[PDB]
Amino acid sequence: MTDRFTRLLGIQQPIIQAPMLGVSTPALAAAVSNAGGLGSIAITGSAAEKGRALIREVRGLTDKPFNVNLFCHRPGQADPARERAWLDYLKPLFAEFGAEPPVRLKNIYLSFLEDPTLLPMLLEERPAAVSFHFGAPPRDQVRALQAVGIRVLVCATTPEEAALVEAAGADAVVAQGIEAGGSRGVFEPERGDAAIGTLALVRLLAARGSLPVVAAGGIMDGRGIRAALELGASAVQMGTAFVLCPESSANAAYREALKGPRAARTALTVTMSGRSARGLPNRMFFDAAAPGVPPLPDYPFVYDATKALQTAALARGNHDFAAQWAGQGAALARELPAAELLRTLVEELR
Amino acid sequence: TDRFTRLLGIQQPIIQAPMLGVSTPALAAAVSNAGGLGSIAITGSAAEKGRALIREVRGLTDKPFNVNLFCHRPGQADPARERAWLDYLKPLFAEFGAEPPVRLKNIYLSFLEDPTLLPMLLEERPAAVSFHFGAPPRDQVRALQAVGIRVLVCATTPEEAALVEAAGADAVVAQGIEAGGSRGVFEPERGDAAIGTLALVRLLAARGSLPVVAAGGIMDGRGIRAALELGASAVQMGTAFVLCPESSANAAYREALKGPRAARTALTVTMSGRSARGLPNRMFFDAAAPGVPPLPDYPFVYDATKALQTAALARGNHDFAAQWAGQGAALARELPAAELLRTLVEELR
Numbered sequence: 001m002t003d004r005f006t007r008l009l010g011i012q013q014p015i016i017q018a019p020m021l022g023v024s025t026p027a028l029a030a031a032v033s034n035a036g037g038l039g040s041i042a043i044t045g046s047a048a049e050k051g052r053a054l055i056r057e058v059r060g061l062t063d064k065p066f067n068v069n070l071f072c073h074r075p076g077q078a079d080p081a082r083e084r085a086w087l088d089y090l091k092p093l094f095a096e097f098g099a100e101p102p103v104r105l106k107n108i109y110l111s112f113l114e115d116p117t118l119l120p121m122l123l124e125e126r127p128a129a130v131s132f133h134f135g136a137p138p139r140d141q142v143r144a145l146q147a148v149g150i151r152v153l154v155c156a157t158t159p160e161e162a163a164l165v166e167a168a169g170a171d172a173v174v175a176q177g178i179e180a181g182g183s184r185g186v187f188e189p190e191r192g193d194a195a196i197g198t199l200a201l202v203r204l205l206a207a208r209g210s211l212p213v214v215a216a217g218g219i220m221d222g223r224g225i226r227a228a229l230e231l232g233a234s235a236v237q238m239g240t241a242f243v244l245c246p247e248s249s250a251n252a253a254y255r256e257a258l259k260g261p262r263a264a265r266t267a268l269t270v271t272m273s274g275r276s277a278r279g280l281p282n283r284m285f286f287d288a289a290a291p292g293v294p295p296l297p298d299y300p301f302v303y304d305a306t307k308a309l310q311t312a313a314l315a316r317g318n319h320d321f322a323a324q325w326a327g328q329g330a331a332l333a334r335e336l337p338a339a340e341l342l343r344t345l346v347e348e349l350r
Numbered sequence: 351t352d353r354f355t356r357l358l359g360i361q362q363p364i365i366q367a368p369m370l371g372v373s374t375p376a377l378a379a380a381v382s383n384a385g386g387l388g389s390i391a392i393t394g395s396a397a398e399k400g401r402a403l404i405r406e407v408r409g410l411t412d413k414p415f416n417v418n419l420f421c422h423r424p425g426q427a428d429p430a431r432e433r434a435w436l437d438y439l440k441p442l443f444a445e446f447g448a449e450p451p452v453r454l455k456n457i458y459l460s461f462l463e464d465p466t467l468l469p470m471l472l473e474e475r476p477a478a479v480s481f482h483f484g485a486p487p488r489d490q491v492r493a494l495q496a497v498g499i500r501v502l503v504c505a506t507t508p509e510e511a512a513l514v515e516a517a518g519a520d521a522v523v524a525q526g527i528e529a530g531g532s533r534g535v536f537e538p539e540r541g542d543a544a545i546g547t548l549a550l551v552r553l554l555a556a557r558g559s560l561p562v563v564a565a566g567g568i569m570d571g572r573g574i575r576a577a578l579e580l581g582a583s584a585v586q587m588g589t590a591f592v593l594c595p596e597s598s599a600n601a602a603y604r605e606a607l608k609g610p611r612a613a614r615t616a617l618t619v620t621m622s623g624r625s626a627r628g629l630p631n632r633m634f635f636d637a638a639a640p641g642v643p644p645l646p647d648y649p650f651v652y653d654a655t656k657a658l659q660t661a662a663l664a665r666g667n668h669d670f671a672a673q674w675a676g677q678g679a680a681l682a683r684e685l686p687a688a689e690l691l692r693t694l695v696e697e698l699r
């Protein structure tokens with residue numbers, strides 16, 4: 001299965017370094033691709049021409065295939081009244097840092113479904129792989145990418161979501177287990193979250209004998225990779241393992257957090273961004289259902305509010321509101337140059 | 351690795367999970383005779399009934415087997431809380447022409463509150479004694495080990511695993527979020543880390559000392575191989591054995607697990623008073639919803655639910671049943687237990 005997948009992508013090793021918005025960089029992606037895996041960058045939140053520049057930066061650092069990731073959520077629905085109430089609720093937190101909340105919130109992460117400039121840019125630049133999170137694009141768009149040689153991956157958290165990935169015509173499904181760090185790939189969180197663990201999810205999707213399955217969530221070493229392959233996966237995707245790499249853009253506080261005792265426990269929160277996401281809990285991790293908490297605005301408007309608070313806190317040296325995403329294998333994190341980490345994972349896999 | 355197999359004197363690193371209401375002496379004996387470790391659960395029975403169940407297993411196998419006991423913090427009776435809960439359930443009872451019970455009972459005595467259990471186990475000396483929801487005091491673990499019993503305790507986190515090591519147990523059963531039935535969380539009031547099997551097993555094997563038994567979501571030899579790659583010394587499988595004819599799952603449960611409902615499991619605290627995974631039905635609702643009163647302690651809640659199940663059953667209604675199943679439920683197979691064990695071994699090899 002790994003022979004099939006590595007051949008499908010242009011690569012030597014069945015290991016994808018996860019795209020991680022705010023953490024992956026062209027340097028990180030190129031290091032992993034150079035070492036033989038599939039490096040990744042995340043381009044959502046940037047204008048298409050900035051995305052183009054980022055893709056070109058990676059190409060200036062590696063000749064090998066890499067992965068470009070875009071969010072494909074339902075386009076956020078602005079709700080000024082609900083957003084106003086949310087900001088008013090956050091007011092005392094801003095005031096701790098001598099700040100006021102932003103006067104309005106913005107749709108800071110445009111979905112692939114709402115920014116028509118993204119697809120033609122990708123068709124021009126032709127990265128080896130394009131991946132989607134939160135949903136699959138229409139079949140005709142997936143086809144357009146494939147027509148110029150691009151391999152298309154989509155994340156799914158359930159067999160039902162995997163069926164939609166299949167119907168979209170993707171080349172592979174990234175099976176994201178509950179272990180995974182960062183945003184959950186749930187398509188329609190208003191319907192709930194089955195919260196299936198990696199070991200069950202990968203086996204269920206592989207037992208379907210359709211798309212190659214890339215296991216994502218909680219994998220930190222070659223033993224984890226071997227286990228994923230035993231379950232039927234064709235490859236793995238690893239985020240938390242690469243966060244401490246010097247090539248990533250994690251800041252010092254994030255690295256310190258992930259190296260220390262806080263790594264012993266991760267949690268899910270919707271109050272950071274408006275969508276369920278896993279990280280090291282802090283003051284942004286509260287109960288949205290608690291008395292006094294007004295209704296949550298839509299994703300990604302909530303994250304715009306949180307980013308403003310993060311900025312105010314950071315300006316006073318306070319890191320207690322940071323987005324420090326991490327999977328349930330966080331305590332097994334290592335700090336190595338990314339090429340060395342890739343090499344080490346391959347040795348462990350053998 | 352032969353770390354677990356040599357510890358228990360068995361041929362195969364596979365435990366058929368103890369499953370209160372589903373495992374039987376016949377199931378345990380079939381699995382043990384086939385070379386694995388069969389298990390029974392004896393909580394909810396008087397010690398002498400537990401003794402009888404242990405003797406039933408011995409009548410059917412000369413091989414090692416596992417006897418499981420709940421080790422939760424003893425439930426505290428609270429008549430006012432229980433009356434409020436019964437009142438909330440009242441319309442459900444009325445739907446079936448029944449009255450709710452007047453009082454709730456502590457139907458599942460913890461190992462910590464029934465002092466007749468330890469002496470009985472010391473006399474009967476099963477090969478393994480296992481504990482769910484907590485570890486007994488070190489002195490009691492030692493008492494069992496002193497007569498040659500291997501002691502297993504379930505843990506859902508590295509912090510709970512540390513308590514298992516502190517208690518001096520022989521092995522830790524790492525229960526991932528995939529697992530069917532009751533979650534082994536020691537102190538649910540502190541929250542639930544809800545760690546998946548793949549992370550949990552690796553964490554315990556990479557950072558701890560004890561042999562790790564992987565539990566949750568494992569349905570075939572590929573799953574067993576995956577667990578061993580993560581560093582487990584054995585596996586424990588519940589859902590996989592539910593459909594065996596030797597189990598005491600009723601027909602509705604068997605048909606539910608075989609049919610389309612197997613595509614979704616969920617956790618509920620409203621069935622028993624403790625978080626547990628199964629095929630969702632009318633007993634699966636949000637305990638934090640508007641108008642829902644505070645939950646009585648475990649296991650008093652389950653006594654209430656059993657009464658409702660009885661009433662619904664009398665009218666041919668199965669929508670309140672406890673049909674526990676793990677997240678690998680869609681991969682369940684229906685075979686004689688010894689034949690399933692043989693198949694798993696072939697798949698493992």
Ligand SMILES: Cc1cc2nc3c(=O)[nH]c(=O)nc-3n(C[C@H](O)[C@H](O)[C@H](O)COP(=O)(O)O)c2cc1C
Nearest residue numbers: 018020021133180181182217218238239240325327
């Ligand atoms: C800090 C961080 C950032 C992430 N950013 C993205 C992202 O921008 N887009 C995306 O599709 N997935 C993102 N992910 C999720 C990964 O693709 C993958 O599901 C996850 O990293 C696997 O879990 P692991 O961290 O245990 O390896 C991110 C994960 C983390 C920890």
Ligand SMILES: Cc1cc2nc3c(=O)[nH]c(=O)nc-3n(C[C@H](O)[C@H](O)[C@H](O)COP(=O)(O)O)c2cc1C
Nearest residue numbers: 367369370482529530531566567587588589674676
């Ligand atoms: C119907 C059912 C009943 C169970 N009963 C018990 C029990 O009585 N005592 C216990 O310690 N574990 C019990 N378990 C949990 C198992 O020990 C084990 O954690 C779980 O079955 C593993 O998940 P799996 O069903 O995916 O194999 C039960 C599980 C199920 C599905």
